[PDB]
Design a binder for this molecule. Structure first.
Ligand SMILES: *[C@@H]1O[C@H](CO)[C@@H](O[C@@H]2O[C@H](CO)[C@@H](O[C@@H]3O[C@H](CO)[C@@H](O)[C@H](O[C@@H]4O[C@H](CO)[C@@H](O)[C@H](O)[C@@H]4O)[C@@H]3O)[C@H](O)[C@H]2NC(C)=O)[C@H](O)[C@H]1NC(C)=O
Ligand SMILES: *[C@@H]1O[C@H](CO)[C@@H](O[C@@H]2O[C@H](CO)[C@@H](O[C@@H]3O[C@H](CO)[C@@H](O)[C@H](O)[C@@H]3O)[C@H](O)[C@H]2NC(C)=O)[C@H](O)[C@H]1NC(C)=O
Ligand SMILES: *[C@@H]1O[C@H](CO)[C@@H](O[C@@H]2O[C@H](CO)[C@@H](O[C@@H]3O[C@H](CO)[C@@H](O)[C@H](O)[C@@H]3O)[C@H](O)[C@H]2NC(C)=O)[C@H](O)[C@H]1NC(C)=O
Ligand code: AGS
Ligand code: AGS
Ligand code: NAG
Ligand code: NAG
Ligand code: NAG
Length: 1808
């Protein structure tokens, strides 16, 4: 058991040792992909980012100075790792050290002190703020722009000049980019009803209040000169500085739109005016005050409540500035704060929130009827520290793909090797020698699995070294890769168990290896949709399981601890498989694959997809015995093998004799261990083979018919393997090897150590191998099945050298080989034992005896009396004239009695007029036919015009016969797209911008804040209560108090930690969380169970959670608690639903001075004094100053926290806050439900310049239809090339070439035909498009472009694939391959270009236009993308002007021109490819050389052919002279060179040396003239299957030139000459064997060629048809036309052909007429002697002495034949008595004489 496994492993390794290239490829190819992956990883390393806090952004409702401070200071949005002052619950303003704030505070306290007084100089002098202001005023420029000075202070042609000055600094250029649209904008409102007029007046009041500096200016200019004239460092500097500041402020006010507010009557006019302003770049925003009572709201409810009181608003702006409003959350989650002002924070610089706040404030002021106050601020939540790395998701989604791409190659090699050893049956013989399937399959396991576990280790090493998977231990990953390798090996064997062909299985198994990877890709995208349980079901496929384990590997890799011994059995997340449980599924799937193979091998088993007896030897010992053995196949009800009672004896070479199909191979195989005997017994050597099992194998050796040799194994290795397996010991295998080696004499050939280098001789080695075990019994099967006659001598000699002591049973089909070797013969026919006996005993048991024929140049009774005188018995069977056959009596035949007859005949020969007597022995050929037949009975330009017409006719008749094939290949693709048009009538979603109802409820269930700070005010209570009302909570405020505690319990384990620390809520309460430790990386931050430890009170309303976080550290709480909400949804990482989005905090501390009443009192006192103006401008200014002083208090404020990862979070909560304020200021009752505000978002239409880019988004569904059109139209040309491939595979194409047809005209006819075929689908497609009214297609300008595209695409694509006919030798496979190639090129190119154009965010990828201009050199890409450009061009024109043409040569014109250029060159290429190629014997040999005979039709002259690599000519130095009026004959054994001679003479194959002339026409000089008068009929039956034979005949006649009227009669005569009457109307495909041959012969005969060539005309043909062939050829030769014919039927040549030539090794031997040959050498008699002594000297000595001629013919130990001088003058009677005496003189049992037999001519054939 172990030795068999060792031998199998040694063989499997010996295969691989020989090839040093496939091993290198399989070792290096998998590593290249991972080196590429290592390079990619080295390209993009991860980046680490720390914590950062964001500053505060104030809204205009809070104020104007802080709002400007936020506009300029907070542009950069720089992170601050430390806490910012704005986040503290008390502080609401960040800038405390700002110069402006210091100036304001100092001024307020100075006026307060002055009002208290009425010392002032002392208070004012000690002020740093005044000194700083003076220094800032005294600045000699030094700044790029005034914005720099403004920043330093805080933290019209003149206007254009100021902008140009600002252009100097790019950083300030961004500031002006943010400022210019709002400064110079044109606000608009489509409704102009008086209510909207009131609203816009309220809004305009803000800008009117902003326009109050000019009044202070003019009071300055009218009070300046008064003081200047009154009084005339302090004075001179002060006056100049005040004047300069006033002038600068006035210059700033010069660039003011002032009345930016404008109105429009309608929405359409609104859009038009906005577009015009955008063209002028003067547009900022547009507003629409749509009324709910109008109810004209697209895709939204008309109104929530009936009647007025509800305000619905739409703010439309430029698309480039407002965020796209199609989707809510990003499609790929990112590990970042999502806070970059340029890319994601668009509303801050866009201005949407500013205008929303202004409009909401105006609306609440109008509706409520009161004056609310609420300073709104915007604050960004802080974010933990993280690491940005895109590479880990790349591994999560891409690692399985690279592994499968690396391991496809080994699966291909394994499947090809298994199917190779399966197809050639080299494995099937190993079962007979004893080896069982288990050993072979275990050898396959342990041998194929080798390279997999040598590549897995290298991959693991590369993974660890290349930093792709660091911080992990290689053992755990190896224990997974090895499981995958086992699973894929079993899968490869399962695939190998499907097919029975080598190349097909090798190419197809690699397809099913990849096709099972698709479900993983299809299910990873639908991660949430699939249930948990179905994942295990989908994990049955091995790559799916590998991917599902690889996601867990990557997920554990993120957390800093890769696959390691600590966490092998731990699930990283609730619904991801642990790395351990994946291996179990992989091994279970491998076992399932093994069981599937085990079952599948059982579906088709077994199939390799008269009582006259003599039993009496001198020693009776039945070493082998078969008794009543019978076997029945289920397919045939009659048994395959019937009763076989034949016995065997040791030492006798018993031979089976029977025709093919008699059950000989089955009977031989039953005795061996390959099939079960159905019944009876098969006792061998005394113990049955089934029972004896391996005990009988060492004494039995079997060699079957098919050759059993392993190609790569050397000469000696075969004997080594085949001796070791039988159980032979190690020391003597050397000797048995040497014995068989010299017995065949291959010692020197053992040095080269090759097995596939030597050919033909291998059968000798295969026969010898059967004797390696010294077996007592040997069962050979056809030892001479397919070897040449030159080598059968060695097989005969060895099989007779091993004849003594070893029973040998062989099976031969030839009748000759049943007498030379067989000691007994058993006749089998139809699976039954017809006859048995011995060769000598069989011959004697006939009714007739010994034949003596008497020819005539007197009277039978005189001869009868003379014969009766010498021998009494005389049977007279034949008495016809000219021959007198006498039957000598075998019963009582005597050597002397027959002798005396010839003695008297010679003396009386003259007067008897016999002139020769013929003695004939009873031949064994006819008795075999006699008994079997008896046994069977017992059981029972003018030429061109006719030339083009025929080619079209042949193709036309092809379509008529096959209409189902034409319909599917042509009509079905056209109807494929047609049904799609109706099914694709759904609305196309492409990216259009709908209107989104911006509200907080759209996001969904969430957690919200209602923290309160400084609640000591009755007014704040109303707002706090109102905030809860909108959230859906219980209306009464005391409900929370009624609920009392509404919080979860504190965890017990955290209580000890809290007690350990101080846990003051304000100061840092909890402990720090985990972070990046330097050597490790973490994506999130993992805290303890104590982050803001006590669960804050939570109340649930209507799908919402509200949390009371008052007096608690908010920043630390948010930072600590953030990752816990996210980690629930990090499993899929596609659409992450955060839980907290936004929250409110009611600030109560005011930044400015709380007491502004004293400032107002001081202002009023100043107004009363100082002579107030009667006009009242100064009084107006001071009244507004007092109003500002009252507004300085800012009694209540509010702050809003928002999460930036939610795009529309800001606006929704601003809307919620404004609605809450409106509810709060409205008194309680039903009025609260009546009043509400709704806000929306809808971007404007695309501008023309923006249309030029957005048209790309407009393509939409067009891509889907274009792909279907390309797919449908990519079918037909493969069907076009199908028929051409079929014609080229058969020789019928060469028949057409040999005819009058020229290949170029044939190609042209094919081109016209298949264009005529292709034209119909184009029209069908056009009418289908026109029927359903596609706007892009039905346009009068577009239609000609589409028609030209379709017609030209058909016209040029066809010549691409005609050259592919030569490459592919099979029709069906080429069809699929070329269709897939067309689909590949077209779809891939079109999709790649279309995607590249869409996503041209970076202009570097836009340069692909030159790549497309390269792609115009390819013809199939032109059709695909060309249709895409057609639809868009009309789409733009439908909106560019209504709200140029495809015929012009830029959209599809380039494609058309280039592809028409491509058209003819491929036809030229294939046409060039078609023409790419550029003593009797001695007397006749000299005659041709000396002179040429004009009568000779065919004259060969020194013809020679040399195949490459053979080094010996197939035909060498061949020359012949053939007279015209006779019929020739050529003879030779298979392999002599007949077919090569016919091909060079005919012209199919090039001639290496020499030329032939036909009818005075040289082949090289003018082949076409020679082609006219020749008719060729090879062995191959070159006909068109689909057409009927008659159509073939009319077609060839039309090529021949028969007049059209007589064509039918010519066809009738041509068919009637060779039957075919019943098969005339039947297609050539459905013909029997002989019918095709006779049809081909008739086709060669039709047209009456001058010379007709026939290669093997008769091969298994009925005698009647061959007789018709005789008659036809006799008539032809009567007419005077030469017929060259070659066949192996020797009786045919003698009867008809005038001359016969026999050829060996390409050289003639006789070259004479049959009658000359029959007399020159084939005359005389040959004595046949049987000698058991095996001594040549005793037999040769007496024959040579008695007869002068001592030539030896057919010398063998079994039987010896002799040659003696022919035509002996002495009587033949001399030998008979001489034989009688010399049988005693020298050892000879019996003899026979061969004198002028019918077989004498046959014996002549064999020897020469
Ligand atoms: C609400 O919770 C907040 C959580 O951040 C907390 O913020 C802390 O604010 C204080 C300053 O008021 C800072 O405390 C730091 O504590 C660490 C302890 O590890 C000290 O090392 C650190 O000293 C410096 O820290 C720098 C950056 O960490 C470092 O580069 C220097 O070399 C030096 O070591 C500070 O003293 C810190 O900003 C915040 N961290 C904490 C948790 O202390 C708030 O105090 C809390 N609410 C309030 C307003 O009290
Ligand atoms: C949100 O949480 C705050 C936590 O301060 C709640 O305010 C507190 O509510 C309780 C009644 O449930 C009151 O406590 C009172 O404290 C004073 C001493 O300051 C004591 O003399 C009283 O007998 C009473 O215990 C008070 O309203 C307030 N306590 C404070 C200032 O801490 C608030 O009620 C929660 N939200 C809602 C709407 O329930
Ligand atoms: C800006 O783009 C909008 C996109 O909706 C254009 O509105 C659409 O314009 C078409 C005319 O081109 C109109 O279609 C009408 O639709 C109603 C049903 O809503 C139908 O009953 C009418 O018979 C007509 O087909 C309509 O104004 C509107 N169509 C819609 C809402 O689907 C708008 O014209 C563009 N404006 C400019 C000047 O760019
Ligand atoms: N695969 C098969 N193997 C053996 N016998 C078969 C097979 N298929 C059919 N038969 C039966 O075998 C009989 C026909 O003769 P076979 O036994 O096939 O001849 P054979 O032994 O192949 O002939 P030769 O001349 O020895 S190669 C009929 O009973 C068939 O139904
Ligand atoms: N596949 C092959 N086709 C043609 N010739 C071959 C082939 N293989 C070897 N030969 C050479 O051709 C000669 C043997 O075949 P030929 O005698 O030319 O033809 P043939 O065997 O009589 O042809 P048939 O009757 O069609 S099998 C020797 O020179 C061979 O070496
Ligand atoms: C500075 O201190 C606190 C910080 O918020 C602030 O309330 C106060 O008004 C500031 N002082 C001034 C007026 O600059
Ligand atoms: C809006 O304000 C401007 C001043 O900026 C004023 O000229 C104009 O008349 C106002 N329009 C309305 C509708 O009040
Ligand atoms: C502010 O000025 C406006 C004029 O623009 C005046 O109508 C209004 O009464 C003033 N408001 C107060 C209260 O100062």
């Amino acid at each position: 058991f172990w030795t068999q496994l060792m031998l199998l492993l040694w063989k499997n390794f010996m295969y691989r040792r020989r090839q040093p290239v496939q091993l290198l490829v399989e070792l290096l190819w998998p590593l290249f992909l991972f080196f590429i992956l290592v390079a990619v990883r080295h390209s993009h390393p991860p980046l680490e980012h720390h914590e950062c806090h964001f500053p505060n952004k104030p809204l205009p409702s809070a104020g104007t100075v802080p709002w400007l401070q936020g506009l300029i200071c907070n542009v950069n949005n720089t992170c601050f790792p430390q806490l910012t002052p704005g986040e503290e619950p008390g502080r609401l303003s960040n800038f405390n050290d700002s110069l402006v704030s210091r100036l304001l505070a100092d001024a307020r306290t100075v006026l307060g002190g002055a009002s208290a007084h009425r010392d002032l100089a002392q208070e004012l002098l000690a002020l740093r703020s005044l000194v700083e202001l003076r220094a800032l005023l005294q600045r000699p420029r030094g700044t790029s722009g005034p914005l720099e000075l403004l920043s330093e202070a805080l933290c019209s042609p003149a206007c254009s000049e100021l902008i140009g000055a600002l252009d100097s600094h790019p950083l300030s250029r961004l500031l002006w980019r943010r400022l210019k649209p709002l400064i110079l904008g044109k606000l608009l409102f489509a409704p102009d009803t008086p209510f909207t007029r009131k609203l816009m007046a309220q809004v305009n009041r803000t800008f009117e209040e902003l326009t109050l500096l000019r009044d202070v200016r003019e009071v300055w200019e009218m009070l300046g000169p008064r003081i200047f004239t009154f009084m005339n460092y302090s004075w001179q500097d002060a006056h100049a500085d005040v004047g300069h500041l006033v002038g600068t402020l006035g210059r700033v006010t010069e660039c003011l739109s002032l009345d930016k507010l404008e109105a429009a009557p309608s929405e359409a006019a609104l859009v038009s005016r906005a577009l015009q302003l955008l063209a002028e770049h003067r547009f900022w925003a547009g507003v629409v005050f749509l009324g709910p009572e109008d109810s004209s709201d697209p895709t939204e409810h008309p109104t929530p409540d009936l009647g007025p009181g509800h305000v619905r608003i739409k703010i439309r702006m430029d698309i480039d500035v407002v965020t796209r409003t199609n989707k809510i959350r990003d499609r790929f989650w990112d590990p970042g704060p999502a806070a970059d002002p340029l890319t994601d924070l668009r509303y801050v610089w866009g201005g949407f929130v500013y205008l929303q706040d202004l409009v909401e404030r105006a609306a609440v002021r109008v509706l409520s009827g009161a004056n609310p106050r609420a300073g709104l601020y915007l604050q960004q939540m802080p974010y933990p520290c993280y690491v940005d790395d895109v590479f880990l998701r790349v591994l999560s989604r891409s690692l399985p793909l690279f592994l499968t791409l690396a391991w496809i190659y080994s699966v291909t090699l394994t499947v090809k090797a298994v199917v190779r050893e399966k197809e050639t049956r080299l494995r099937d013989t190993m079962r007979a020698m004893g080896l069982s399937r288990a050993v072979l399959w275990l050898g396959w396991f342990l041998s194929c699995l080798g390279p997999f576990l040598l590549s897995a280790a290298l991959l693991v090493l590369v993974l660890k070294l290349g930093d792709i998977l660091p911080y992990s231990h290689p053992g755990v990953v190896f224990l997974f890769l090895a499981a995958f390798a086992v699973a894929t090996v079993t899968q490869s064997f399962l695939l190998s168990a499907f097919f029975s062909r080598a190349n097909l299985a090798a190419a197809c198994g690699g397809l099913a290896y990849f096709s099972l990877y698709l479900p993983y890709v299809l299910c990873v995208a639908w991660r949430d949709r699939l249930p948990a349980g179905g994942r295990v079901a989908a994990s049955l496929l091995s790559p799916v399981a590998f991917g599902f384990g690889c996601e867990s590997l990557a997920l554990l890799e993120e957390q800093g601890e890769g696959a390691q011994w600590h966490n092998v059995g731990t699930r990283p997340t609730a619904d991801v498989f642990s790395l351990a449980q994946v291996s179990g599924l992989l091994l279970l799937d491998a076992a399932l694959y093994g069981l599937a193979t085990w079952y599948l091998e059982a579906v088709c088993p077994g199939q390799y997809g008269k009582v006259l007896v003599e039993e009496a030897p001198p020693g009776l010992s039945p070493g082998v015995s078969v008794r009543s053995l019978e076997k029945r196949f289920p397919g045939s009800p009659q048994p395959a093998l019937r009763g076989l009672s034949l016995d065997f004896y040791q030492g006798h070479i018993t031979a089976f004799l029977g025709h093919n199909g008699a059950g000989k191979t089955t009977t031989l195989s039953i005795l061996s261990g390959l099939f079960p005997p159905s019944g009876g017994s098969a006792f061998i050597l005394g113990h049955d083979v089934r029972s004896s099992m391996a005990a009988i194998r060492p004494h039995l050796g079997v060699c079957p018919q098919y050759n059993v040799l392993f190609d790569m194994l050397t000469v000696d290795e075969h004997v080594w393997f085949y001796g070791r397996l039988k159980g032979l010991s190690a020391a003597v295998v050397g000797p048995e090897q040497d014995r068989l080696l010299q017995d065949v004499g291959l010692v020197s050939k053992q040095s080269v150590q090759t097995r596939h280098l030597s050919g033909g001789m291998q059968r000798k080695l295969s026969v010898a191998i059967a004797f390696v075990g010294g077996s007592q019994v040997v069962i050979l099967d056809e030892p001479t099945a397919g070897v040449d006659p030159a080598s059968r001598r060695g097989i005969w000699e060895l099989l007779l050298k091993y004849r003594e002591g070893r029973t040998l049973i062989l099976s031969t089909h030839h009748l000759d080989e049943a007498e030379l070797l067989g000691d007994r013969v058993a006749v089998v026919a139809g699976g039954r034992l017809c006859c048995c006996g011995s060769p000598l005993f069989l011959r004697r048991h006939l009714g007739s005896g010994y034949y003596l024929t008497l020819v005539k140049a007197v009277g039978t009774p005189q001869l009868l009396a003379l014969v009766q005188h010498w021998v009494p018995g005389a049977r007279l069977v034949e008495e016809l004239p000219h021959e007198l056959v006498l039957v000598l009596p075998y019963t009582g035949a005597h050597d002397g009695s027959f002798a005396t007859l010839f003695r008297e005949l010679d003396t009386r020969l003259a007067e008897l007029r016999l002139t020769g007597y013929g003695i004939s022995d009873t031949s064994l050929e006819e008795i075999f036919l006699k008994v079997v037949e008896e046994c069977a009975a017992d059981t029972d330009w003018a030429l061109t015009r006719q030339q083009l017409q025929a080619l079209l006719l042949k193709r036309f008749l092809l379509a008529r016969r096959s209409r189902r094939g034409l319909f599917a290949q042509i009509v079905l693709p056209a109807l494929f797209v047609g049904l799609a048009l109706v099914f694709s009538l759904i609305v196309p979603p492409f990216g259009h911008y709908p209107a989104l109802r911006l509200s907080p409820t759209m996001y969904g269930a969430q957690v919200s804040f209602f923290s309160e700070d400084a609640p000591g005010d009755p007014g704040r209570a109303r707002l706090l209560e109102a905030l809860l009302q909108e959230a859906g909570l219980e209306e009464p405020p005391v409900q929370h108090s009624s609920h009392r505690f509404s919080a979860p319990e504190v965890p017990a384990e955290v209580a000890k930690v809290l007690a350990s620390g101080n846990w003051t809520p304000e100061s840092p309460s909890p402990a720090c969380q985990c972070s990046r430790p330097g050597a490790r990386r973490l994506l999130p931050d993992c805290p303890a169970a104590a982050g803001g430890p006590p669960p804050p009170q939570a109340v649930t309303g209507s799908g919402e959670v509200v949390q009371n976080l008052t007096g608690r550290n908010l920043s630390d709480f948010l930072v600590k608690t953030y990752p816990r909400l996210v980690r629930q949804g990090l499993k899929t990482k596609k659409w992450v639903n955060e839980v907290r989005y936004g929250g409110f905090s009611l600030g109560g501390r005011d930044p400015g001075l709380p007491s502004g009443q004293e400032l107002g009192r001081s202002v009023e006192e100043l107004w009363a004094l100082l002579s107030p103006l009667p006009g009242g401008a100064l009084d107006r200014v001071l009244k507004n100053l007092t109003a500002w002083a009252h507004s300085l208090d800012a009694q209540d404020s509010l702050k809003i926290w928002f999460n930036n990862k939610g795009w529309h979070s800001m606006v929704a909560f601003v809307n919620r806050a404004s609605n809450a304020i409106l509810r709060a200021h409205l008194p309680p009752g039903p009025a609260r439900h009546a009043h509400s505000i709704t806000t929306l978002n809808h971007p404007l239409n695309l501008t023309k310049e923006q249309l030029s880019e957005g048209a790309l988004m407009a393509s939409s569904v067009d891509v889907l239809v274009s792909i279907c059109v390309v797919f449908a139209m990519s079918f037909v040309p493969a069907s076009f090339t199908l028929v051409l491939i079929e014609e080229r595979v058969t020789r019928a194409k060469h028949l057409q070439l040999m005819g009058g047809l020229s290949p170029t005209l044939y190609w042209l006819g094919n081109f016209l035909w298949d264009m005529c075929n292709y034209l119909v689908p184009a029209c069908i497609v056009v009418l289908i498009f026109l029927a359903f009214q596609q706007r892009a297609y039905v346009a009068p300008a577009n239609l000609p472009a589409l028609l030209l595209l379709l017609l030209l695409y058909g016209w040029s694509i066809t010549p691409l694939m005609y050259p592919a006919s030569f490459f592919f030798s099979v029709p069906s496979t080429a069809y699929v391959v070329l269709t897939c190639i067309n689909l590949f090129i077209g779809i891939n190119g079109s999709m790649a270009t279309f995607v590249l154009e869409l996503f041209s965010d970076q202009k570097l990828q836009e340069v692909s236009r030159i790549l497309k201009q390269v792609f115009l050199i390819f013809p199939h890409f032109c059709l695909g993308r060309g249709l895409i450009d057609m639809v868009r061009n009309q789409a733009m024109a439908d909106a560019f002007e209504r709200l140029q043409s495809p015929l012009r040569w830029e959209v599809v014109g380039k494609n058309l021109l280039a592809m028409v250029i491509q058209g003819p060159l491929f036809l030229l290429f294939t046409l060039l490819l078609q023409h790419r190629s550029q003593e009797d014997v001695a007397r006749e040999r000299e005659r041709v050389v000396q002179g040429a005979t004009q009568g000779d039709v065919l004259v060969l002259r020194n013809l020679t052919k040399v195949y490459r690599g053979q080094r010996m000519p197939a035909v060498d130095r061949l020359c012949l002279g053939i007279p015209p009026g006779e019929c020739f004959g050529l003879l030779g054994v298979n392999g002599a060179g007949k077919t090569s001679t016919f091909r060079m003479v005919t012209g199919d194959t090039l001639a290496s040396r020499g030329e032939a002339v036909l009818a005075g026409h040289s082949v090289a000089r003018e082949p076409s003239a020679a082609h006219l008068s020749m008719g060729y009929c090879p062995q191959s039956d070159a006909i068109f299957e689909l057409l009927t034979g008659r159509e073939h005949l009319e077609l060839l006649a039309r090529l021949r030139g028969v007049p059209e009227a007589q064509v039918a009669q010519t066809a009738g005569s041509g068919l009637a000459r060779l039957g075919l009457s019943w098969y005339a109307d039947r297609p050539a495909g459905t013909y029997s064997g002989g019918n095709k041959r006779k049809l081909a012969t008739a086709l060669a005969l039709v047209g009456d060629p001058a010379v007709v060539f026939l290669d093997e005309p008769t091969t298994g043909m009925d005698p009647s048809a061959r007789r018709f062939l005789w008659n036809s050829l006799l008539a032809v030769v009567r007419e005077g036309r030469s017929v060259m014919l070659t066949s192996h039927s020797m009786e045919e040549c003698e009867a008809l052909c005038s001359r016969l030539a026999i050829m060996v090794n390409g050289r003639f031997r006789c070259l004479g007429s049959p009658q000359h040959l029959k007399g020159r050498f084939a005359a005389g008699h040959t004595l046949t002697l049987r000698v058991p002594a095996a001594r040549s000297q005793p037999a040769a000595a007496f024959v040579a002495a008695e007869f002068p001629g001592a030539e030896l013919r057919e010398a063998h130990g079994g039987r010896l034949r002799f040659q003696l001088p022919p035509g002996g003058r002495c009587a033949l009677a001399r030998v008979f008595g001489e034989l009688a005496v010399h049988g005693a003189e020298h050892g000879v049992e019996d003899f026979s004489v061969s004198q002028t037999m019918l077989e004498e001519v046959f014996l002549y054939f064999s020897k020469d």
